[PDB]
Amino acid sequence: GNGAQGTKFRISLGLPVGAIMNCADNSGARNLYIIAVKGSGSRLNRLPAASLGDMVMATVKKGKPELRKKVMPAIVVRQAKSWRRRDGVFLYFEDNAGVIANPKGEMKGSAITGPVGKECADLWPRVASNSGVVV
Amino acid sequence: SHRKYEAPRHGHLGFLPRKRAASIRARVKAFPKDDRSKPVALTSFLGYKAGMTTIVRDLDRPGSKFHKREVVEAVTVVDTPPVVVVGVVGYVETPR
Amino acid sequence: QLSWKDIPTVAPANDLLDIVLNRTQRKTPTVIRPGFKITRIRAFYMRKVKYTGEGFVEKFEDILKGFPNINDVHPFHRDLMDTLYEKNHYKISLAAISRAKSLVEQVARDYVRLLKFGQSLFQCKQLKRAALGRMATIVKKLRDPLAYLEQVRQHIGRLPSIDPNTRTLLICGYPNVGKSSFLRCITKSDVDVQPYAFTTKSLYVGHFDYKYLRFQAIDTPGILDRPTEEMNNIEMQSIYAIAHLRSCVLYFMDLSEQCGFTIEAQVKLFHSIKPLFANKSVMVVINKTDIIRPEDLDEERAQLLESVKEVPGVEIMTSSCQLEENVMEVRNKACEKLLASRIENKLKSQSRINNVLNKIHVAQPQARDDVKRTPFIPESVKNLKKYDPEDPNRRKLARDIEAENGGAGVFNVNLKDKYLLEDDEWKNDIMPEILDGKNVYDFLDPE
Amino acid sequence: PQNDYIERHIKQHGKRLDHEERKRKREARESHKISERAQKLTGWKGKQFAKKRYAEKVSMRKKIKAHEQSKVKDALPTYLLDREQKFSVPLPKVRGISEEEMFKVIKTGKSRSKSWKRMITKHTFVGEGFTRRPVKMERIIRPSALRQKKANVTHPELGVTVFLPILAVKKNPQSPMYTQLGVLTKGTIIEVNVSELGMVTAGGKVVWGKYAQVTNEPDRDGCVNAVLLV
Amino acid sequence: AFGPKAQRKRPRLAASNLEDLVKATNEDITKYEEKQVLDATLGGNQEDKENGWTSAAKEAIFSKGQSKRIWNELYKVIDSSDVVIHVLDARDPLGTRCKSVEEYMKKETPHKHLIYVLNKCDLVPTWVAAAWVKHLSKERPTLAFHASITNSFGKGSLIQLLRQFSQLHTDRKQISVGFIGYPNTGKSSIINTLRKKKVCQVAPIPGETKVWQYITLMKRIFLIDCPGIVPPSSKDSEEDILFRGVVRVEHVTHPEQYIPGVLKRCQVKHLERTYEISGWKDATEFIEILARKQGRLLKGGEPDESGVSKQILNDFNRGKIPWFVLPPEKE
Amino acid sequence: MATRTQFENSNEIGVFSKLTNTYCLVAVGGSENFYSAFEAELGDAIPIVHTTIAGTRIIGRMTAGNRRGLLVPTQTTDQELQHLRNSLPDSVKIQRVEERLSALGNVICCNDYVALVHPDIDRETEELISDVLGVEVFRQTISGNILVGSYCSLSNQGGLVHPQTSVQDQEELSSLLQVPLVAGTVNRGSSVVGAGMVVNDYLAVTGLDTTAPELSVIESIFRLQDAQPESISGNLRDTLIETY
RNA sequence: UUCAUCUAGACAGCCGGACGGUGGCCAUGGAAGUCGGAAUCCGCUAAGGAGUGUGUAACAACUCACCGGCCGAAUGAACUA
RNA sequence: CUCUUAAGGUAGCCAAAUGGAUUAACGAGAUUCCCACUGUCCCUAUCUA
RNA sequence: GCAGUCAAGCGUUCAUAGCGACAUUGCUUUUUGAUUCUUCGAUGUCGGCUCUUCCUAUCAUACCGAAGCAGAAUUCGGUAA
Ligand SMILES: Nc1nc2c(ncn2[C@@H]2O[C@H](COP(=O)(O)OP(=O)(O)OP(=O)(O)O)[C@@H](O)[C@H]2O)c(=O)[nH]1
Ligand SMILES: Nc1nc2c(ncn2[C@@H]2O[C@H](COP(=O)(O)OP(=O)(O)OP(=O)(O)O)[C@@H](O)[C@H]2O)c(=O)[nH]1
Ligand SMILES: [Mg+2]
Ligand SMILES: [Mg+2]
C-alpha cells in the first residue's frame, strides 16, 4: 500500500470487478468501471473486490472525451453496503461512489460532492482536504 | 496430469477421525508444567455455559488506531458456583 | 539521462552458454520414451528448441535496452563517452549483439518447422541437437564484444551526474595550480590531494547553495600547451567540459614558486585556450599567493600579466588555500557574474515574466477602514528561552519521558494530569455519563 | 560515488584487519576442498566438474612444455606475405533406403478409406518454375519446408567451403525414380554453380557449373553438405 | 580500445583547431535541442506516466486476417495458381492494395503473372474510375469490374483475357488462377458472376470465405478463391482497418467514438439525404437527432447511442452512403 | 521562525494539527514525536492538547477557531467536548455547531479579525461564527475555488493563496482581509497551501520537503523572523525568476 | 615398474646473499625487472632472469628462480594393478 | 509489325417512374450483438410437500 | 553436420600401417543497437473443468557464497519440497 496513512482495518467488500460507480469529484467524468483492485489476495475463482477507502483501477464509461480509453487510479469513498463501525453500529450510504486520483494518492479535481466516509478520509490525507462533508 | 492450477486443501487432517466424542465432558490432556517454589493452588475449574451478551470497554493499547477510543464486543458468561473437594489421587512414574 | 547506473549485467560467452543451457534442462521435462506417440515425441523437442531460443533472445534484449544509445542523448555526454569508450567500438559491439539476436531467432524459427515432419525419436533428437548446437556456435563468437561491454557497463555506472543546463562554475588550469584544493574548500568531496601533475584523471563534481539557489562546481584534470593535435584522452575531458557547458570559468594561476612554472608559458596556454571563452565570462584568479604577493612582480612580468586584461572581459582577484576566508568572495563574485547573464537571458523570453507575475508580486490592502487590527503575541513567549538540543539542563521534552519509561508503542501517556480544575486532587476522576436511561451530560449544567 | 571510490577508500583506510590471513587460509583449504568436491557432486555436476578438471590439466601440460622449449630454441610475394587465410567418388556404397520409409501414406475422404496419396519425407530440389499441381490430380506430395535451394560445398584441396546454389540432381543412388523426383539423400550427386570460386579452363573459358557429392543425411539436420568433384 | 590494457591515448582524429571545434559544438547543441522541441509537439506520454494512468489493451477483433491459419492458405493458393489476380476496392484502392506480397511474388515466383482487378465500380463516378484505371495501368494490366450475376460489367473482358493466358501455356493441360485481396472486396462475387450461378457463398459480413475452393470453367482453366488477408503493418491506425471494411462492427466496444471519422470522410450534403436529416454539428448531436427521429429510445426515454452508431458504420461500409477517395491528379 | 517537521511520514501538517495564537491541538496516533516537535518550539508558553474529533486523527479539517473561541462539528462526542473544555482555559469559548458542511477547517478560513466562508454555509452558522470568534464574515471563493479554508493560509500578518489565483482576485481579497497576499506553494510544489502548514503571529510549521525558495516566501510574507517586512521580496525577485 | 638427488649433507623448515653497465632501447603526462612492443646481450661470481608475484602516480619495500649457513638419512617424479 | 491506357473534380450522358438479386411478408430453419433481467457466478444459507 | 589443422596417449613392438581425447579454423547474407511487415502442407489427436497425492530438475518465503556489492534495487550459485 503506497500513499496511504497507516494500517487499514477490514470492512465488508461490496463492489467486485465489473461494477460501475459514480464520480464524485468534478474532473469531468460521470461514472467509473472497476477492473482491478490494488492490494488484493489470490484464490481460485475469487473475484477481486473493493470496499470503502480502497484504491482501484478504472476506466471512464461516460464523461469527458479527453478522459476515456485510459485506465486510471481511483479511491472508493461511498459504498451502499452495510458495514460495521467500532462504536458499534452498522451503516450504509445511498450509492457507490469514488474519485479519480494518482498513484501517490493526490486528487485530480478540486472539490468532492456529498458525504465521505471517515474510513477513507482518515486513510488518504488529500481526500480529507477536498471533502467538504465527512460522513 | 498435474491439476493445472494449485489450490489449498479442504479441511484439516489433524482433527481426524471426525467421530463422536466419548463423553459429554471433555477431558484435560495437559496441565501447566510445575514449580515447587510456589504456593499450592488449583489449575482448572468446572462451569456451565450460559449465553452471550455485549460489552463496551475503554481501550488502552499504545500503537493501535483505537488507543483512547471505545470498542463494542461480545462476551460469554459461564456460571460457576463453588466446587467441593472429595478426594485425592497419587500417580507413580513408570517407564511406561 | 543523467547517470545510467541500472544496466543489468553481462556475462561472458562461456558462462552465458551455461546459464541458458542449464535453464532449459532444469525448467523443461526430461524423460521421453520411444513407445509414446509420435505427436508427443515431436512436441517434446519443439519445446526444447523454443525455450532455449527465448532464453538467448531475452538475454540479448536486456543489453540492447540498457545501454544509453550514444547517438541523440546530448552533445556533451556524447563527446565525453566518445573520448572515454571509443564511439566506433561502442556502436560496433552493440550491432554485433543485435545481429546475433536476429540470427538466433531465425534458427529457432526454422528448426521447429523441420521438427514437425520428423518420423522417429532418433531423427527428432538429432534435429534438436543440431538447433541447439548452431545456437551455441552463434553465441561463442561474441567472446570479444561481451567482454568489452562488461567493462564499459561497470565504468559507466560510476560516472558523475553532470547536468548541462544548470548553474555551473568550471575550475581549470595547469597541473598543480590549486583547483582541486579550491573545489575541496568550497564543496565537500573526496579528491586525492597529493602534489604531482596528474593526481586526477577525470572530472569531479560538487554542489553548494548560494542565495537560496543550487550551484555545481566542476574540477577538470588540466591541459598542457601541446599544439592541439597531440593531446590525450585526458585533456579532451577538460576541453569538452569548457566547450559544452554554459558556466563561469575560474582560471587559476600559480604565480608562485612551488611548481612555479614559466608565466610566459601559462599566459600562452591561456591565450591558446582563449577561443573556448566565447561567452563564458571568465575570471582569472591568482592562487598560492601567501608566499609571493604579486604586487612585488617585475615590470616585464607585469606586462605579461597585463596581456590578459585586453580580452573582452576578465576580472582579476587573488587568494590562497591557507587564509580560507577571502576565498568565499571569489565564488560569490563568480556566482553574481553567472546570475547576471542567467536573469537577463530568462527575461529575454518575455512570456515567462507575464505568467510568473503571480508569484513575485504582493497585493496591498488599500486599508478600507480605520479599525485597528494589530498582531497579538503573549508574554509567556517573549519570556521563553531557546531549546538547545545539547545543553546539560534544558526542557524535558515529553518524548524523552516516552523513550525512558518506556518505548514508542509501549508507553501509555496519561491524557489527564495536563489540565486545569478548581482542585488538582480530583483530576484522576470518572464522569458517569449514564443513569437508568438518562444520559447524564444532558441534565448536567450549573444552576 | 562518481569515480574509483572503492580504490580510493582502500588507499585511504584499507580493506580490513583480518583480510590477508583469511585469504591466505582460504588458499590453503583450497586443495582440501577441491578433492572433497570430486567425491561428492553427484549427477551431472560430477561430469561438468571432471571435464574442466581434465581440460585444466591439459592446459598446464601445454604451458609447461612450451616454457621448457623456450630455453634452448612457401615463397609468397611481398604483398601476399604479412597476410593470412582413378575416377572413383569419395562415397561409394552408402546404406540403402527402402520405399517404406521416405514415403508416407495420406488418407482421404470423410471416413478416411481412399488413401492413394504419398508424401516424401526427405529433402528435395524441386526445380525452377515449380507451380504445384491441382489437389485432385496431385499424388506425390513434396512439402514446402523440405525444399532446398543451396548447399555448403567444399574444395578437397584449397581448404575452403562456400554456399553455392544447386542447379540439378544429376544422379541419386538406389533408384532412378528418386533421381527424377529430385531427392537429396546421402551419396547423391548434384550440380552446383561455382562462379564464386573463379575457375578458368584451358582455352580461357569460365567454368560456372560442376558436380559435387552430398556427404551427410540432411534429414537429421538442415544443411546440405557437399564435396566438390575435382 | 578500453580495459585493463587499453593501449590508446589520443582521440580520433585530432580535430584541426579549437576555432572550428567550438563552431561544430555550438551548432550541434542547437541542432540537438530543436529536435526535442519538435518531438515534444509531435508527441507527451511522460505526463501520462506522472498521472500514473495508461492506455487500455487493444481489442482482438482488430487482428484479422492475420493469424497464420489463413496465411497458410495464402501461400498454398499462390503455389498452386498459375496466374494471380489482386482485387481492389474502387472507393479507396490504395488502402486495400496490400503491396507486401508483390515483393514476394516478384522475388520467389517470377513466372506467375499477377494482374489487377478493380471492382465495385458502380459506387464511384465514371471519371474517378477511369482515372484510377489509368493511374494503376503503369504497373500492371488492371481491368475494371462490377460483379453481379444478372447485371455485371467486365465479364467479357475478363473471359477473353483468361483465354489468352490459357493459349500461352498450350502445353500445361490446364491453368489455375487465384483471387486474392482484402476481406469484403468481392473475390467470391467475381467467381459467381463469371460462372453465372451461386457457386461460392457471399455475404456482407467480412469473414465469409474461410478455406480455399476449386471451381472449373472451360475444362482447361480453374479458379481458386481464398480468405481475405490484412498484412500485419505495425503502423497506420486502429481506425483505418475499420473504414476499410475488415472488422465485424458488432464487436467493437464503443462504436460512437468513430463517427467523427464518418463525418470527415463523407459529405454533409450526401449525409443529409439518407436519414433524412436535421441540421447539426458535433457528431454527438448528429447521433442524437438521428436516434430521436428513428425511435431508437432506451428504457425511458433517452436515445440509444451505440445501437445507432453500429448501423451508421454498417451503412457506411455496405454501400448505402456515397463516398470515395479522390484519384491522383493529372500530370 | 519557520520549522519543518512531519506527522508519521506525511507532510500535511495542517491536516493533523491546528495552531492558533493561544493554543495548539495535535493528533494522538503512535508516539510523542509530533507533540515534541511543538513542545521544542513553544515549551510551556501555550497549551498543547492531544485530541481527536469524532474518533479520527484529521483534527485540522474538522475544527475552526482563533484566540477567542473554537468551533467543533456535530459529530463530536460529549467525551471529547468535555476533554477540550477541561484542557483549555476559560478565556476561550467553545461551541459545537450543527452545519451540513461538517468540515469546518475546509469551510472557514479565519484569523483574529476576519473570516472567509464557503458560499453555501447557512445562516445559523454564519451568525454563530461572528458571535463566538468575534470576527467579520465574507462569503467568497479563491479564484473560483470552493473550500477557502484549505486553499489559503491566514495570519494577522499576511496570507498565502494557491498559485492559480488571479492577480485581480489577489487584489480584491487583500482589500477584504487587510493583509498582504502572495501565490506560492508548499511541500515541493503543492497547491493545497492551507492543508500543508500551520501558521500564526509568531510561528510557522511546514512539511519536510518545503524547499528553500518556498521557506523564504513563507518566512517573508508572514513576517516571521525579525525582520522580514514584506518588501524583502525585492531582494527575492531574482531567485523567484530563476525558480519559476 | 621405470628414472633421478644424496654424508664433496638429500627432502621440510628457519637465517644470510639476491650484484655491476643499468632508470638497457621504442614508446608518453607518468612506466626505474613487473600497463605495453622488439631483443633478450655483456661483466663479475658460490649464485643472482634486461625478471615469478605482491606494491607505488612514478620510486622505495617484501618475495621465488638460483646460491650459502643451522640440523642430520633417506627423498622426489612419472607410470601400471 | 495487320494490333490494344482515350474519359477529370462529390455524381455522367442516355434509355421508358426505374436502372433492381443489397428482393417485402412469413418461420418449432442456422447465426452475431444490444437494452432489460436475473443464484449463471463471487458463495452460499434457509423453507414446504 | 561436413571438410580440414593440431597432438597426450593407444595400437604386438610402430607415429608416419593406423586410430586418436582436449584445443582450433572454414560458412548459413549486409561490422555502426537500423526493423526484418516467413506467418509456407503436423493425416492424427488437445483442452478444461472437480478433487487428492507424489517427485525436484526451486518461481516466492528461511538461511548462506561470489560479484565495482557505497546505500537502494539486482545478477550468478549452495542447502532446502
Ligand atoms: N602551501 C600551499 N600550497 C598550495 C596552496 N594552494 C595549492 N597548493 C598546492 O597544491 C598542491 C595540490 O594540488 P592542487 O591544490 O589540488 O592543484 P592541482 O594539482 O592542479 O589540482 P588537480 O589537478 O585537480 O588535482 C599542494 O601540494 C600544494 O602544494 C596554498 O594555498 N598553500
Ligand atoms: N455495390 C456493389 N457491391 C458489391 C459488388 N460486388 C460485391 N458487392 C458486395 O460486397 C460483398 C462481397 O462479398 P464477397 O463477394 O464474399 O467478397 P469477399 O469477402 O472478398 O469474398 P470471400 O472470399 O467469399 O470472403 C457482398 O455483400 C456484395 O453484396 C459490386 O460490384 N457493387
Ligand atoms: Mg594532482
Ligand atoms: Mg470475405
In short:
The structure is cut from a larger assembly and holds chains A (135 residues), B (96 residues), C (447 residues), D (230 residues), E (331 residues) and F (244 residues). Chain A is mostly beta strands. Helices cover 3% and strands 29% of the residues of chain A.
Structure commentary:
Chain D: It is found in: Nucleus, Nucleolus. Chain D: Involved in the biogenesis of the 60S ribosomal subunit. May play a part in the quality control of pre-60S particles. Under normal, rapid growth conditions, high levels of NSA2 would allow the progression of pre-60S particles through the ITS2 processing. Chain D: This is Ribosome biogenesis protein NSA2. The structure is cut from a larger assembly and holds chains A (135 residues), B (96 residues), C (447 residues), D (230 residues), E (331 residues) and F (244 residues). Chain A is mainly beta and 135 residues long. Chain A has one helix at residues 118-121; strands at residues 15-16, 20-23, 31-37, 49-50, 55-59, 70-78, 83-85, 89-91, 97-100. Chain A has a single domain (14-135), classed as Ribosomal protein L14/L23 (Ribosomal Protein L14), CATH 2.40.150. The longest helix of chain A is centred in the last third of the chain and has 4 residues, at 118-121. Chain B starts with 47 loop residues before the first strand and ends in a 17-residue tail after the last strand. The longest helix of chain E is centred in the N-terminal third of the chain and has 25 residues, at 18-42. In chain E, 37% of the residues lie in helices and 10% in strands. Chain E folds into two domains: 68-225, P-loop containing nucleotide triphosphate hydrolases (Rossmann fold), CATH 3.40.50.300; 238-318, Conserved Hypothetical Protein Ylqf, Chain: A, domain 2 (Orthogonal Bundle). The N and C termini of chain E lie far apart (57 Å). Chain E contains twelve helices and seven strands. Chain E has a six-stranded mixed beta sheet, sandwiched between helices. The A-B interface holds A 6-7, 9, 43-44, 86-88 and B 5, 7, 54, 56, 65-66, 69-72. Strand 6 of chain A pairs antiparallel with strand 1 of chain E. Bound molecules: guanosine-5'-triphosphate (2 copies) and magnesium ion (MG) (2 copies). The site of one guanosine-5'-triphosphate has 22 residues of chain E, from helix 7. One magnesium ion binds at residues 183-184, 206, 208-209, 228 of chain E. Chain C binds three RNA strands through helix 1, helix 2, helix 4 and helix 5.
Task: Quickly count the helices of chain B.
Answer: 0
Q: From the alpha carbons, calculate the radius of gyration of chain B and give it in angstroms.
A: 23 Å
Question: Which structural class fits the helix and strand makeup of chain B?
Answer: mainly beta
The string of secondary-structure elements of chain E, in order, is: HHEHEHEHEHEHEEHHHHH
Q: Please tell me what the overall shape of chain B is.
A: extended
User: Strand portion of chain E, in percent?
Assistant: 5-15%
Largest sheet of chain E: 6 strands, mixed
Structural class of chain E: alpha/beta
Number of strands of chain B: 2
Computed Rg of chain E: 27 Å
At CATH level 3, the topology of the largest domain in chain E is Rossmann fold
Provide the β-strand percentage band of chain B. Answer: 15-25%
Strand order of the largest sheet of chain B: 1-2
CATH superfamily of the largest domain in chain E: P-loop containing nucleotide triphosphate hydrolases
Distance between the termini of chain E: 57 Å
GO molecular function (chain C): GTP binding; GTPase activity; RNA binding
Subunit structure (chain C): Associated with nucleolar and cytoplasmic pre-60S particles. Directly interacts with RLP24.
Keywords (chain C): GTP-binding, Nucleotide-binding, Nucleus, Phosphoprotein, Ribosome biogenesis
Subcellular location (chain C): Nucleus, Nucleolus
